[PDB]
């Protein structure tokens, strides 16, 4: 049982939120007998790598001496963006490729991460007046810029919030917001709309803070009480919530053109603005609908 590896060190340079990278290498069974290889967790872990990394494939069989290409894939999703933004984690790791009944091959993962305004907290964003990678704001300039664009160009946009944008454009939008305060956000209306949704979904702390979540549900049927739960939010969360509710009510006025109705808004934004750490799903939509109507 022996393996030959084309390389053992891999660099993931300038890693960005939601931008896929792949570092490929070739494994070749140079032994005299067939071998089984698989990536394994380092002593006392659950997984063989961190969330933003993946091996494809991560296990296999090799006769002597067939070869197999392994793809080491880096993808920073909403699960990891905040810890990488923060520096609580780094683009580094060790992959232990294991021969069943044999040697271990150590692969070293290195590189660097570029922080994004996406996956950054509303509070920190409201405290930063310049782009992340160039008295606090009432709302993050980045959410203002996205909503500003939609308000200007997308009020009459067919199927707004129902058609997915373009992956390329999404990334352009995020990079744009990370590095500039532009005169125009690039990309179609559908892209900007989806970037907004992604922004809300990427928030380390949802627009409606986690601890208020349960109170929201309980209060779901009394409009005077829902509004008061909202009052408990920190200033920037309260402002973003009110801002968005006002925006969505604005869009509802043009429903005959943009197809944005209360149904769709409820089901789409509820889960984004009101996350937990069933029929609670119903009190949630009810909670939101209370504000839209």
């Amino acid at each position: 049982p022996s393996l030959e590896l084309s390389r053992r060190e891999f660099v993931f340079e300038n890693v960005k939120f939601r931008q896929l990278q792949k570092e490929k290498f070739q494994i070749s069974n140079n032994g005299q007998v067939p071998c089984h290889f698989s990536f394994i967790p380092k002593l006392n872990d659950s997984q063989y790598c961190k969330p933003w990394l993946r091996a494809e494939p991560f296990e296999g069989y090799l006769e002597p001496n067939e070869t197999v290409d392994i793809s080491l894939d880096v993808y920073v999703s909403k699960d990891s963006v905040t810890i990488l933004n923060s520096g609580e984690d780094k683009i580094e790791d060790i992959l232990v490729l294991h021969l069943d009944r044999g040697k271990d091959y150590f692969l070293t993962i290195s590189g660097n991460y570029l922080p994004s305004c996406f996956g950054t907290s509303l509070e920190a964003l409201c405290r930063m007046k310049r782009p992340i990678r160039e008295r606090p704001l009432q709302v993050p300039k980045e959410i203002w810029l996205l909503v500003d664009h939609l308000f200007k160009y997308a009020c009459h946009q067919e199927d707004l919030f129902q058609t997915p944008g373009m992956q390329e454009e999404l990334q352009q939008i995020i990079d744009c917001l990370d590095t500039s305060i532009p005169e125009t956000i690039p990309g179609s209306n559908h892209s900007v709309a989806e970037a907004l949704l992604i922004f809300l979904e990427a928030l380390p702390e949802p627009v409606i803070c986690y601890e208020l979540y349960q109170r929201c549900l309980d209060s779901a049927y009394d409009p005077r009480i829902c509004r008061q739960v909202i009052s408990q939010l920190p200033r920037c969360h309260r402002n973003v919530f009110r801002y968005l509710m006002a925006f969505l009510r604005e869009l509802l006025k043009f429903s005959e053109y943009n197809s944005v109705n209360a149904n769709m808004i409820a089901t789409l934004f509820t889960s984004l603005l009101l996350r937990p750490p069933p029929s609670d799903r119903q009190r949630a939509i009810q909670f939101l609908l209370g504000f839209l109507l």
Binding site: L137, W144, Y243, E250
Partner: peptide, 13 residues
């Protein structure tokens, strides 16, 4: 009245 709020919140941008 969205445009009023939005204008205010765009202060400093």
């Amino acid at each position: 009245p969205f445009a009023r709020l939005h204008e205010c919140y765009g202060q400093e941008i």
